[PDB]
Amino acid sequence: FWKKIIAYQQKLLNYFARNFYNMRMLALFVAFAINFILLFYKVSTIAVHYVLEESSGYMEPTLRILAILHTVISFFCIIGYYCLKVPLVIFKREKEVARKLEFDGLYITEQPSEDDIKGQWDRLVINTQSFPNNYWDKFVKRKVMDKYGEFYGRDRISELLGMDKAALDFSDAREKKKPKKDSSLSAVLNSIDVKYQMWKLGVVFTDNSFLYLAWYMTMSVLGHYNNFFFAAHLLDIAMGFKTLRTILSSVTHNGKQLVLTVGLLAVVVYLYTVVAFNFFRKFYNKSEDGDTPDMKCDDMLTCYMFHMYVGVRAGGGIGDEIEDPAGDEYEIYRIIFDITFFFFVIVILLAIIQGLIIDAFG
Amino acid sequence: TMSVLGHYNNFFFAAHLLDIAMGFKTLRTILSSVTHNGKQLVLTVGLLAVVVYLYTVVAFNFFRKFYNKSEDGDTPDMKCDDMLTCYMFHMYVGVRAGGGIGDEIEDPAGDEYEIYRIIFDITFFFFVIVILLAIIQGLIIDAFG
Amino acid sequence: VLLTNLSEHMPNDTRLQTFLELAESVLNYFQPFLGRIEIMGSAKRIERVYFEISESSRTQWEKPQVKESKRQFIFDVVNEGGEKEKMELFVNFCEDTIFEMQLAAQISESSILTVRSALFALRYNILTLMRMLSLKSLKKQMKKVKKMTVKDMVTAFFSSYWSIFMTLLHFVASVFRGFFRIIC
Amino acid sequence: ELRDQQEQVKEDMETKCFICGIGNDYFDTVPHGFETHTLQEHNLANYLFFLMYLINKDETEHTGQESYVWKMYQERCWEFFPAGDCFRKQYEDQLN
Amino acid sequence: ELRDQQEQVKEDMETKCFICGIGNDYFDTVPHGFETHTLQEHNLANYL
């Protein structure tokens, strides 16, 4: 009974761990199929409702079956992750906390910075009895004993680590053992370590990849309510393909500098907006009808939005969109304004972005 | 075969001008810049297609009213009422435009989705027009180096 | 200084080794304050010189601004410099840095909430998940599943992970709510 | 060019000592020899501290070596800086 | 390529003598040995 169910559980876990990657590839393939089906919708004529138009008539049941299969594979990819990749994360965390405890005394001599989520959460696993569950070294609690027992108090270090002196004395002394059965389910519930499993669940929840897979499953579930939510699964190609990762590394290598370039561009455009708002406010009419003028720089926020949207997206600058300054007493100043805008914004900064990407490649 | 078909249609002789790449080694040195990173150049186009498809999804779900392309008010030429048509619009006109899709779609001035649409256009211009084309150019320059 | 000089000038000396062990504590205390350089002596030989480094000097040297100045000086002397004037530029930099550290010593005379909220959400949401087993009231469920079926087996196996994914979603929602409350 | 300059600076400081200029492999014949030489024997911070101590020390209390270095530094002669030689190379046979 | 060529020229003239071609370290075994050799013994201006 107990042995049979444990064996069957182990078989299921082994199967999912073995097929984790194949299921991850299958999810992407089903996502490409669903999104190719989604490309043939029509808006029908108020209450407008999205229909799938097709001559065959089958591809709506195709879409339903594919959505259900995608959701099932998404759930199975979470299960396979939990069976396969979680133990490595737990092993690494238990190794790190053990080394910090031994060779740094991070819970004896000094204390966590109270700003470290990992350091604060790892206080729980120390007192647990199932510590190095995954890490090989099962004598770390005795090494800490032999290292800090004399200085910081043997009983105090024992209370910190969760060891029981009376338990060891009882084991060494003379008693009469009483038989037990694994069949006793109340006994097995008492035997399981609640605190260690709580710490493990916290580590898993704080894991980034598990969070990504949960987001994937949530997206797949919402896809049933709205079929276009399946398009978000096409964002998995970056992780699916390493060759695409090599391309994306060009952008991500200098991402901070790419963001700072945009910030600098925003500041420069704001300065140009200040100048235009104070001196060149009469050239920003944007209406052909002379009766109603659509002034776009009477407001500072509107002028900044104009400069950041139309002036930036224009190939020639803001002068391609604002009124001709011909025959005006501010002609030279406005021409300098437009030329400097074109040179600094359109030419130099975009070249900075391109140079950043090329430098990342090199 | 091309030369033989040239007798039936004299313009079939233009395909023989494609032999210059093999004829000249100096032209081969130039073409090596493109062919050195051809797989990455194709993958860049694939990524661009995926990004444009995502933008098409967003526009089709939220900004469908700004895609009228007819001057006559009697007959409206909506280009995003169909998903395939919207994707074709975004891949052809939006990509070939120097400023992005906003250079071709209606002005969002005085609209309750003005800020969202402006963010849409700015992100389209930055990611598609600026970054990805720069990726292609950087690939060619990296091949040279 | 005497013991260090003797140890370095008489490397393989078992008799001196024991005295080094006996003086280990004093040497460990004075290690930060002991300076050691090599110079081209008057006897046309390389000689080691032992001097005293002050604690204030060490701190002002390890101040970040002085480290940035050191990095800039190294960059400049490496990219644009010559072997002849290298040791002149180094001394000029040393003099300027010494003056700036002396002036600094002269003048120098006399989020947690987000982490806590995330920790609380993580504890609460996982405790909710574990309550079903901590209450030890699963006896009615065990009574209904006395009948052993492979289908019920597999269904419970999947249900465990499904409950885990609700617990993770709940934890994530709680974290977002807490972050919004903190910022607002 | 900026990237190449930074890489050149890093390579030079990782492959040769700042003061004597001897390559890293010669010291690396002994394990961790280059790090030991560049952080204990020929540390530039140690030279800076030596100049600081020699300046802040009274001239009458100078030892023979300190007086030698002081005179050389006053006359702006940098021959006392080891160039191409070190303690290890000077006492190669006796030390090993 | 122009920058690389300039850097290569500088590196070659700083690391090996123009006439004999012996490396800089061999002369640098004596302090300022490379400069002395390339400016007093094997100076190309002296040959001119």
Ligand SMILES: Nc1ncnc2c1ncn2[C@@H]1O[C@H](COP(=O)(O)OP(=O)(O)OP(=O)(O)O)[C@@H](O)[C@H]1O
């Ligand atoms: N004479 C020298 N003095 C000091 N370091 C030298 C010398 N010659 C070579 N080096 C090398 O220069 C490097 C010094 O490292 P670096 O300047 O980054 O130290 P740091 O104080 O830790 O810097 P950071 O500010 O980046 O933390 C080492 O690799 C060292 O071996």
Ligand SMILES: Nc1ncnc2c1ncn2[C@@H]1O[C@H](COP(=O)(O)OP(=O)(O)OP(=O)(O)O)[C@@H](O)[C@H]1O
């Ligand atoms: N045979 C050689 N003759 C001269 N210099 C040599 C020779 N071999 C190597 N060198 C090196 O070439 C360099 C000559 O320097 P450079 O040509 O810049 O001198 P310069 O007359 O001062 O130039 P500049 O016009 O830039 O002032 C030195 O670093 C020297 O060590």
Ligand SMILES: [Zn+2]
């Ligand atoms: Zn040295």
Ligand SMILES: [Zn+2]
């Ligand atoms: Zn020579």
